[PDB]
């Protein structure tokens, strides 16, 4: 029937900054002109919702995407892999990593 | 702020709230056709007026914008479109009657019966059987009766409707600052953007005698050659200094020649090239049609068909009471979307048609990256031309062997050239001149030089000039040929044909010269040549956001519509057309009739 529950920010004044997160929601203005609240002449609102469908070509079919960020500064660092351990073994003589 | 930063951002709104609505309709209307059931058509309904209801109010909002400014020649182009009034022009009394008067004339024209005078209860109508019957029939007399109950019972009402549809219709286009309707018409064919590259609509009109001169020997030997045939034919009706009448063209038009093939075939014990009966034998079905036919659009090098296509679109035999209407269609339903509509089965017009409908849908893709507005071709003969060289080119015998279906040691010689270049000239050429002169009667009827009285004199006149077609019957002024045809009766241009024609030939000979091919032209074949379907896909790609003059500018080196691949196709045709009938003359005498 249309998945029309995600919507995307269409009309700005400006750019977004990197690391910023907007969610305002007001009327568009493309003239000089107030709009008072109303969808006027050169007054739109900023979100638009999406239309995805099943029978829609590739490329226009709903995709997630989810960036990971990673940062180093001055505290100490705690996200890493498990570093995985080899065997044990005894009466030999090797060389350990304890 | 500027007016282009306005008239971009109301662009911008309009159209991602029109493709969904646009993508909505379309598959209302698949559904409609696919499951012919009482619910699809309201659903239909439903789905298609809310667009016009919608697409009304976004093109009231596009007048306030001072469309003078604008550059770029794209943001103007694309609120023009968006600027078109197009019937509002008029009160509602007039606008209403004129849609109550379309709605009837198409009605009657659908509804023709005409009863033979032995059974008065039981008629006939345009459907097979009367169609049949004076189609592919020897009687001459019954042919002639059956032309004139079909002109007599049809035309006959159509006459007042005409006379007050097309002085309507001049209103309205005045009203839209269009003196002519010929002009509204020929609007589509007018560019007045990049310099060097600007069309007018007059230009169309000269154009169209400039590009039809020269084809008229071979016309004129075709018809002579026509002539002699009906001398074979049916003696003491046709004679050698006048033509044949129109019941004679084995069309109700004319339009098509090709039940006249049979009576004008060139040798006879040659057989043209068909593989049916070995497609049944290698077991081909329409899956096998498509996929191989899929192949050689890749060997051309057009780009891969997408997932969906095998599983949305029908392609042959629904069978039991879920019933689809298959007219061959291709169908771009946007956001993505493209299917065909067929009945698909064993026989060379099918291979040739799902290959025409396959390369509309690769047309479709072509222009599938441009904006809502401008998801078309440059004018409406590239697309249909598009869709029908690739028909033309894979019915080679080359071809035909190069897919496992002819004998690997089968050998074409000159007869069997013969007869398939005919064969095809006959279908192809056999409705230029008189496209010419319908398109010419209706350019002038609309303009108004013809008075009232003037009207069916002047069309039969010209007919039997430009065409060589006289009255079997007399007719005065009583009847209305031109109201029992499908373009007239239903408002479709007609000129779209006769620049495709030319178009595709265009394109196929460019092609031919730019694929490393030697011969003769019919002969030709573009499959295994990327470069060639790259050089193609060069003009495909560019759809509606350019002029058709720069269009003709990628496949061809010339801008200007040129006709001589027409001539160059059917050189062996011509020459065999002069060196065999050297005792007849070509033409005709205007002054003979069968009746007078």
């Known amino acids: ?98 | 702020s500027t007016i282009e930063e306005q008239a971009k951002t109301f662009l911008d709104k309009f159209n991602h709230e029109a493709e969904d609505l646009f993508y909505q309709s379309s598959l209302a209307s698949w559904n409609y056709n696919t499951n012919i059931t009482e619910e699809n058509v309201q659903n239909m309904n439903n789905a298609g007026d809310k667009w016009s209801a919608f697409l009304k109010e976004q093109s009231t909002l596009a007048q306030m914008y001072p469309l003078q400014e604008i550059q770029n020649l794209t943001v103007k182009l694309q609120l023009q479109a968006l600027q078109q009034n197009g019937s509002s022009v008029l009160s509602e009394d007039k606008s209403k009657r004129l849609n109550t008067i379309l709605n009837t004339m198409s009605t009657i024209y659908s509804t023709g019966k005409v009863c033979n005078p032995d059974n008065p209860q039981e008629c006939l109508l345009l459907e097979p059987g009367l169609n049949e019957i004076m189609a592919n029939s020897l009687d001459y007399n019954e042919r002639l009766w059956a032309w004139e109950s079909w002109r007599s019972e049809v035309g006959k009402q159509l006459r007042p409707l005409y006379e007050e549809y097309v002085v309507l219709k001049n209103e309205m286009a005045r009203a839209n600052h269009y003196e002519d309707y010929g002009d509204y018409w020929r609007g589509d064919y007018e560019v007045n953007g990049v310099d060097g590259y600007d069309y007018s609509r007059g230009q169309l009109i000269e154009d169209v005698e400039h590009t039809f001169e020269e084809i008229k020997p071979l016309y004129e030997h075709l018809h002579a050659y026509v002539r002699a045939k009906l001398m074979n034919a049916y003696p003491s009706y046709i004679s050698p200094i006048g033509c044949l009448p129109a019941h004679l063209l084995g069309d109700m038009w004319g339009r098509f020649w090709t039940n006249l093939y049979s009576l004008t075939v060139p040798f006879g014990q040659k057989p043209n090239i068909d593989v049916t009966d070995a497609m049944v034998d290698q077991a081909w079905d329409a899956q096998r049609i498509f996929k191989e036919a899929e192949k050689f659009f890749v060997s051309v090098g057009l780009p891969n068909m997408t997932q969906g296509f095998w599983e949305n679109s029908m392609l042959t035999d629904p069978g039991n009471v879920q019933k689809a209407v298959c007219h061959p269609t291709a169908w771009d339903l946007g956001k993505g979307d493209f299917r065909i509509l067929m009945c698909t089965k064993v026989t060379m017009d099918d291979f040739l048609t799902a290959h025409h409908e396959m390369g509309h849908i690769q047309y479709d893709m072509a222009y599938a990256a441009q904006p809502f507005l401008l998801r078309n071709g440059a004018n409406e003969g590239f697309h249909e031309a598009v869709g029908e060289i690739m028909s033309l080119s894979a019915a080679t015998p080359k071809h035909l062997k190069s897919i496992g279906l002819l004998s690997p040691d089968f050998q074409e010689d000159n007869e069997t050239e013969i007869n398939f270049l005919l064969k095809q000239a006959l279908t192809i050429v056999g409705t230029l001149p008189f496209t010419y002169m319908l398109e010419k009667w209706r350019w002038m009827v609309f303009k108004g030089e013809i008075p009232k009285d003037q009207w069916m004199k002047k069309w039969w006149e010209m007919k039997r000039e430009i065409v060589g077609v006289v009255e079997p019957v007399p007719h005065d002024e009583t009847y209305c040929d031109p109201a029992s045809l499908f373009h007239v009766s239903n408002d479709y241009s007609f000129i779209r044909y006769y620049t495709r024609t030319l178009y595709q030939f265009q394109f196929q000979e460019a092609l031919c010269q730019a694929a490393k091919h030697e011969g003769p032209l019919h002969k030709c074949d573009i499959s295994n040549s990327t470069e060639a379907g790259q050089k193609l896909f060069n003009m495909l790609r560019l759809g509606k956001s350019e002029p058709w003059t720069l269009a003709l500018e990628n496949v061809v080196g010339a801008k200007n519509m040129n006709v001589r691949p027409l001539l160059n196709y059917f050189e062996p045709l011509f020459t065999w057309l002069k060196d065999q009938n050297k005792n007849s003359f070509v033409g005709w005498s205007t002054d003979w009739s069968p009746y007078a």
């Open chain 1, 1 to 98: 029937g249309g998945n029309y529950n995600y919507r995307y920010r269409l009309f700005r004044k400006s750019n977004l900054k990197p690391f910023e997160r907007d969610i305002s929601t007001e009327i568009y203005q493309a003239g000089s002109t107030p709009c008072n609240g109303v969808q006027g002449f050169n007054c739109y609102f900023p979100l638009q919702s999406y239309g995805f469908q099943p029978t829609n070509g590739v490329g226009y079919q709903p995709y997630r995407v989810v960036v990971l960020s990673f940062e180093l500064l001055h505290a100490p660092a705690t996200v890493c892999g498990p570093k995985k351990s080899t065997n044990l073994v005894k009466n030999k003589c090797v060389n350990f990593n304890f």
